[PDB]
């Protein structure tokens, strides 16, 4: 059930962890407490896909008040994806950084936000302005 | 749209 979901979520092929995280945010849609599977979807975050990072960022966005001490395992990934040459993934990282309301996290996140308020492509600046 | 159109002029300066 959720254990076989975690087994698919600890795989090596992309087309099982992708269906895993889509199944996770379909379980979140119908109103399930899938909060216990938090630090195992975040292993399936640092992906070459961008159609998948939106879903993982969404899961982080909903389930950080309920897993607040667990949520410190995304900060390096936010400051890692706030360097990428694609402006869409930078602005996605910036509008994800602000939505996580965890008081152990926002202290660390002022440096890439300072980097992105002066960034070039004005999609990420119009994101970072509201992220302030 | 079953009906038909009518051409309007371009310049009319």
């Amino acid at each position: 059930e959720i254990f076989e979901l975690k087994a698919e979520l600890n795989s090596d092929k992309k087309e099982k962890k992708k269906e895993a995280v889509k199944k996770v945010i379909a379980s979140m849609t119908v109103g399930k407490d899938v909060s216990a599977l938090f630090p195992d979807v975040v292993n399936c975050m640092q992906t070459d896909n961008l159609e998948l990072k939106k879903l993982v960022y969404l899961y982080l966005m909903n389930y950080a008040k309920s897993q607040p001490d667990m949520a410190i395992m995304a900060v390096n990934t936010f400051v890692k994806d706030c360097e990428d040459p694609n402006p869409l993934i930078r602005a996605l990282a910036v509008r994800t950084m602000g939505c996580i309301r965890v008081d152990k996290i926002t202290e660390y996140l002022c440096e890439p936000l300072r980097k992105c308020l002066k960034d070039e492509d004005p999609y990420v600046r119009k994101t970072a302005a509201v992220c302030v | 749209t079953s009906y038909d159109y009518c051409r309007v002029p371009m310049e009319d300066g």
């Binding site: 195992d40 410190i72 390096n76 936010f78 152990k104 | -």
Partner: protein, 165 residues
């Protein structure tokens, strides 16, 4: 198709040699508050590497990879004698588990550019690697700024992953 970690106390140059194996540069990197995961394709066995930093708020957050976990690398910080003691206590906390059992140990002697650094024998005798039952361990001297000794330790690691020709 075998996975591997990089844990240990922070400021050990472990993300340094991680992106040295990944890219081949000396990368500029902040202290890794969360984690890092990429992969390395070499010797036809994918070395998927999982760095986790060594801050005190993320020391209890190492167990969350230990489900479906096949390898282990402990990256020492030999240039801090006042922190290698708590690194050893962290290591004996980590190797006191019943869930990490097939994962062989792999010690990397990292940051080998200072003359204060020890050899591959004094660090072993201090950390007590001979007294580790059911643990296939091997220490390896790796210099981060050059990149020497990395792939030889990975070759021993690939001898530990598969057991064939």
């Amino acid at each position: 198709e075998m996975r591997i970690l990089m844990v240990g106390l922070d400021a050990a140059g472990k993300t340094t040699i991680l992106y040295k194996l990944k890219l081949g540069e000396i990368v500029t990197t902040i202290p890794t508050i969360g984690f890092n995961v990429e992969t390395v394709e070499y010797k036809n066995i994918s070395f998927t590497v999982w760095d986790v930093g060594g801050l005190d708020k993320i020391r209890p957050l190492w167990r969350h990879y230990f489900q479906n976990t096949q390898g282990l690398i402990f990256v020492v910080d030999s240039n801090d004698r006042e922190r290698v003691n708590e690194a050893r206590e962290e290591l004996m906390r980590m190797l006191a588990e019943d869930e990490l059992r097939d994962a062989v140990l792999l010690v990397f002697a990292n940051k080998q550019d200072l003359p204060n650094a020890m050899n591959a024998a004094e660090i072993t005798d201090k950390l007590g690697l001979h007294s580790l039952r059911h643990r296939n361990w091997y220490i390896q001297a790796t210099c981060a700024t050059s990149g020497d000794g990395l792939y030889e330790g990975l070759d021993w690691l690939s001898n530990q992953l598969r057991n064939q020709k």
